[PDB]
Amino acid sequence: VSQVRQNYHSDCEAAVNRMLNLELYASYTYSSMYAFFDRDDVALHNVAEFFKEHSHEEREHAEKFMKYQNKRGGRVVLQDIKKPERDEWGNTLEAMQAALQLEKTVNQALLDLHKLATDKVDPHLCDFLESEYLEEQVKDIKRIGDFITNLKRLGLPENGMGEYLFDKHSV
Amino acid sequence: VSQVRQNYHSDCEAAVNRMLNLELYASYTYSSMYAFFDRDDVALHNVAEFFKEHSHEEREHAEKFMKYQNKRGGRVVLQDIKKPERDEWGNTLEAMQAALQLEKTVNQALLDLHKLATDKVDPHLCDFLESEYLEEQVKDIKRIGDFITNLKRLGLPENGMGEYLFDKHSV
Amino acid sequence: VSQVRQNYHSDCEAAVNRMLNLELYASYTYSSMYAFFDRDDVALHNVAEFFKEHSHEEREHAEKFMKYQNKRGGRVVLQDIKKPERDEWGNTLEAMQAALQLEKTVNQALLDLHKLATDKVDPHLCDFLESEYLEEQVKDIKRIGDFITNLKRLGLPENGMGEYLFDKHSV
Amino acid sequence: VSQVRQNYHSDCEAAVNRMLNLELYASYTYSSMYAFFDRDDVALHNVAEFFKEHSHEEREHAEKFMKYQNKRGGRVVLQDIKKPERDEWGNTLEAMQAALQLEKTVNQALLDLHKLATDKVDPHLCDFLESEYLEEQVKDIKRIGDFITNLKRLGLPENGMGEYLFDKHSV
Ligand SMILES: [Cl-]
Ligand SMILES: [Cl-]
Ligand SMILES: [Cl-]
Ligand SMILES: [Cl-]
Ligand SMILES: [Cl-]
Ligand SMILES: [Cl-]
Ligand SMILES: [Cl-]
Ligand SMILES: [Cl-]
Ligand SMILES: [Cl-]
Ligand SMILES: [Cl-]
Ligand SMILES: [Cl-]
Ligand SMILES: [Cl-]
Ligand SMILES: [Cl-]
Ligand SMILES: [Cl-]
Ligand SMILES: [Cl-]
Ligand SMILES: [Cl-]
Numbered sequence: 001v002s003q004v005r006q007n008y009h010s011d012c013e014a015a016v017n018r019m020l021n022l023e024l025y026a027s028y029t030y031s032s033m034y035a036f037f038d039r040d041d042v043a044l045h046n047v048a049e050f051f052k053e054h055s056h057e058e059r060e061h062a063e064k065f066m067k068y069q070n071k072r073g074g075r076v077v078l079q080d081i082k083k084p085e086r087d088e089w090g091n092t093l094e095a096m097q098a099a100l101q102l103e104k105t106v107n108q109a110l111l112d113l114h115k116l117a118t119d120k121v122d123p124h125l126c127d128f129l130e131s132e133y134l135e136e137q138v139k140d141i142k143r144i145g146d147f148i149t150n151l152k153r154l155g156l157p158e159n160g161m162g163e164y165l166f167d168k169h170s171v
Numbered sequence: 172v173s174q175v176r177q178n179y180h181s182d183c184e185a186a187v188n189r190m191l192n193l194e195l196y197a198s199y200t201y202s203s204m205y206a207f208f209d210r211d212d213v214a215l216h217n218v219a220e221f222f223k224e225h226s227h228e229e230r231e232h233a234e235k236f237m238k239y240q241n242k243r244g245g246r247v248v249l250q251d252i253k254k255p256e257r258d259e260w261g262n263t264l265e266a267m268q269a270a271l272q273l274e275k276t277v278n279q280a281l282l283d284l285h286k287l288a289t290d291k292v293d294p295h296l297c298d299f300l301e302s303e304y305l306e307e308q309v310k311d312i313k314r315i316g317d318f319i320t321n322l323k324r325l326g327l328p329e330n331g332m333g334e335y336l337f338d339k340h341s342v
Numbered sequence: 343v344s345q346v347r348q349n350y351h352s353d354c355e356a357a358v359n360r361m362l363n364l365e366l367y368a369s370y371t372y373s374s375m376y377a378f379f380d381r382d383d384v385a386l387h388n389v390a391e392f393f394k395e396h397s398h399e400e401r402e403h404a405e406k407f408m409k410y411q412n413k414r415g416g417r418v419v420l421q422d423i424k425k426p427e428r429d430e431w432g433n434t435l436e437a438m439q440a441a442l443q444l445e446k447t448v449n450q451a452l453l454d455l456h457k458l459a460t461d462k463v464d465p466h467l468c469d470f471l472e473s474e475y476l477e478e479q480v481k482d483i484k485r486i487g488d489f490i491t492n493l494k495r496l497g498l499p500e501n502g503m504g505e506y507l508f509d510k511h512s513v
Numbered sequence: 514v515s516q517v518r519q520n521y522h523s524d525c526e527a528a529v530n531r532m533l534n535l536e537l538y539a540s541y542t543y544s545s546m547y548a549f550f551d552r553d554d555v556a557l558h559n560v561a562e563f564f565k566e567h568s569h570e571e572r573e574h575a576e577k578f579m580k581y582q583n584k585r586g587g588r589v590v591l592q593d594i595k596k597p598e599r600d601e602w603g604n605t606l607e608a609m610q611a612a613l614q615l616e617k618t619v620n621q622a623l624l625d626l627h628k629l630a631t632d633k634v635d636p637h638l639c640d641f642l643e644s645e646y647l648e649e650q651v652k653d654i655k656r657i658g659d660f661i662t663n664l665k666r667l668g669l670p671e672n673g674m675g676e677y678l679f680d681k682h683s684v
């Protein structure tokens with residue numbers, strides 16, 4: 001047992017490792033979206049940079065879980081980072097839709113981890129999730145939903161002018 | 172009943188008073204460690220100052236509980252501050268080991284208070300503990316554990332050169 | 343065919359994708375080393391931060407290949423990022439030895455890519471590798487070799503005092 | 514023989530003169546595009562200025578070859594600068610398409626010169642091309658391709674509103 005370990009359940013330690021992997025997976029998906037929008041035959045650079053920024057954000061989320069694991073006396077265990085679901089992302093609307101679903105998947109995993117922490121009576125882990133993850137997640141989901149509403153308003157996927165306008169005025 | 176009192180259980184009020192006393196006890200133990208490392212036949216001044224700083228931190232923790240008690244309409248009840256367990260602390264490793272155990276004792280009391288607050292459905296007290304105590308406690312425990320690992324690496328208790336090096340490069 | 347594509351062989355495009363994956367793999371290995379040295383029972387924070395910085399450097403190398411691929415009209419194709427070879431890294435010497443071998447593996451892949459680019463008469467790709475990768479790689483290999491020499495001098499793996507001194511004066 | 518001349522093949526000297534002429538030709542084509550978009554019945558001033566800037570860039574490329582020729586002890590030999598292929602450029606999409614093809618023509622000539630320099634074992638000329646020409650060429654081709662993708666997205670040539678929007682938000 002680690003000398004620092006106190007009130008930290010094995011199940012929570014394992015779930016933190018799985019959560020870490022999911023954050024890395026989300027980062028990698030966003031990296032893929034960046035590369036797609038940077039293609040010469042897609043060429044929506046502000047959209048590309050939005051996804052690149054999100055990729056970095058998700059990596060930071062993962063690193064914060066590594067730090068957390070060690071602070072509690074748990075042990076970081078890494079697994080493969082699976083490649084993203086798609087190799088190409090269609091257009092701004094399809095990508096934003098995929099991002100919304102990804103964000104909700106990550107959110108569900110965070111909420112499940114919070115429930116586990118609650119069941120194991122771990123208020124430190126609860127606080128960590130509430131203070132560092134859950135609100136940023138709600139904010140991100142709201143921003144992406146707002147974007148989707150606007151992309152539909154702008155006539156996506158068919159309206160190329162609408163897609164151009166979004167890239168130039170929303171991101 | 173205090174005019175401000177709302178959703179504050181008698182059991183929680185009493186437990187806050189006991190927690191206050193424990194913080195003062197921890198402060199006093201750290202004061203003792205400061206005085207020991209300041210001895211001419213011990214003479215590890217950076218180590219002494221580390222413990223002096225922790226003594227002040229613990230006193231601040233106690234004062235914050237006094238303020239909390241009054242904010243909720245509870246009444247501060249003081250008891251004797253018991254003298255520390257030891258009069259002399261051996262060396263840097265023994266002292267850090269004692270500090271780790273003290274920090275875990277304080278942490279357990281905070282977690283027990285959080286459980287009581289949860290049982291009495293007191294979210295304000297839960298928030299207070301999570302926002303002002305529980306994370307600082309985890310951070311402090313991690314720092315002391317890290318120190319112990321390094322002190323063992325440096326050959327404590329036997330290696331006096333190792334002890335000197337720690338005082339000059341870690342604190 | 344991409345409208346921008348000129349003098350860019352399919353073999354080079356594929357090799358750039360494989361190189362990208364290797365950079366990500368190297369990043370992930372360094373992330374693992376960071377987490378290990380951040381453990382409470384390892385606790386060499388300057389060493390941890392060295393590896394964390396290298397993890398970020400390798401990610402930047404990967405992103406630069408993504409940008410390169412698109413600039414030439416190639417298409418980014420991502421694969422799984424394999425987890426690192428080890429879950430724990432022994433000590434500073436073992437980790438630095440693993441880092442040296444990793445850096446040489448990455449260097450060999452860069453040199454192989456340069457040879458392919460030479461065979462396909464692609465001076466732009468040659469220039470990119472020479473200007474952005476090959477010298478940084480030689481510099482990094484030299485720095486790590488220098489560290490290993492010093493760690494051996496300091497009596498690693500047995501000499502814990504030597505390991506402490508390295509963390510406090512070399513990184 | 515020039516007193517400075519060393520490892521400079523007659524074939525490379527002649528090819529540098531031809532390359533110089535091509536840069537001047539490219540400059541002149543861009544000047545024509547500037548004048549077209551400045552017409553009162555075309556009136557896309559940001560597009561005009563983009564081409565004017567490129568005209569100046571190409572002239573600078575030519576001047577750098579003159580300087581290069583003298584540095585190696587070769588002799589600058591000038592030929593007529595042929596007028597551009599067209600007197601009018603249709604619209605933003607047609608012009609960008611012509612610019613892409615022009616840039617690829619210039620790029621091919623640079624790559625051919627690099628191959629000649631390689632065959633004649635002239636690393637100074639290789640370095641000059643790689644360091645001063647080849648990457649700027651790839652960057653320019655990528656930018657123009659990105660523009661074409663966006664112009665098509667915006668409904669060019671038919672969509673006049675799309676053309677206006679491009680002029681006001683992309684250049
Ligand atoms: Cl535990
Ligand atoms: Cl507990
Ligand atoms: Cl457990
Ligand atoms: Cl696990
Ligand atoms: Cl009450
Ligand atoms: Cl209530
Ligand atoms: Cl009560
Ligand atoms: Cl009481
Ligand atoms: Cl090609
Ligand atoms: Cl070619
Ligand atoms: Cl090919
Ligand atoms: Cl591939
Ligand atoms: Cl010569
Ligand atoms: Cl020679
Ligand atoms: Cl000759
Ligand atoms: Cl000539």
Ligand SMILES: [Fe+2]
Nearest residue numbers: 023058061106
């Ligand atoms: Fe995340």
Ligand SMILES: [Fe+2]
Nearest residue numbers: 058103106140
């Ligand atoms: Fe996210």
Ligand SMILES: [Fe+2]
Nearest residue numbers: 194229232277
């Ligand atoms: Fe305290």
Ligand SMILES: [Fe+2]
Nearest residue numbers: 229274277311
């Ligand atoms: Fe404390």
Ligand SMILES: [Fe+2]
Nearest residue numbers: 365400403448
């Ligand atoms: Fe790298």
Ligand SMILES: [Fe+2]
Nearest residue numbers: 400445448482
């Ligand atoms: Fe590297």
Ligand SMILES: [Fe+2]
Nearest residue numbers: 536571574619
């Ligand atoms: Fe040029």
Ligand SMILES: [Fe+2]
Nearest residue numbers: 571616619653
């Ligand atoms: Fe050009």
Ligand SMILES: [Mg+2]
Nearest residue numbers: 010011013014
């Ligand atoms: Mg376990």
Ligand SMILES: [Mg+2]
Nearest residue numbers: 018019021022
């Ligand atoms: Mg998973």
Ligand SMILES: [Mg+2]
Nearest residue numbers: 082083421422
């Ligand atoms: Mg798979």
Ligand SMILES: [Mg+2]
Nearest residue numbers: 130131132135
């Ligand atoms: Mg918050």
Ligand SMILES: [Mg+2]
Nearest residue numbers: 181182184185
């Ligand atoms: Mg009472």
Ligand SMILES: [Mg+2]
Nearest residue numbers: 189190192193
């Ligand atoms: Mg007590």
Ligand SMILES: [Mg+2]
Nearest residue numbers: 252253254255
């Ligand atoms: Mg007594």
Ligand SMILES: [Mg+2]
Nearest residue numbers: 126127297298
């Ligand atoms: Mg709560």
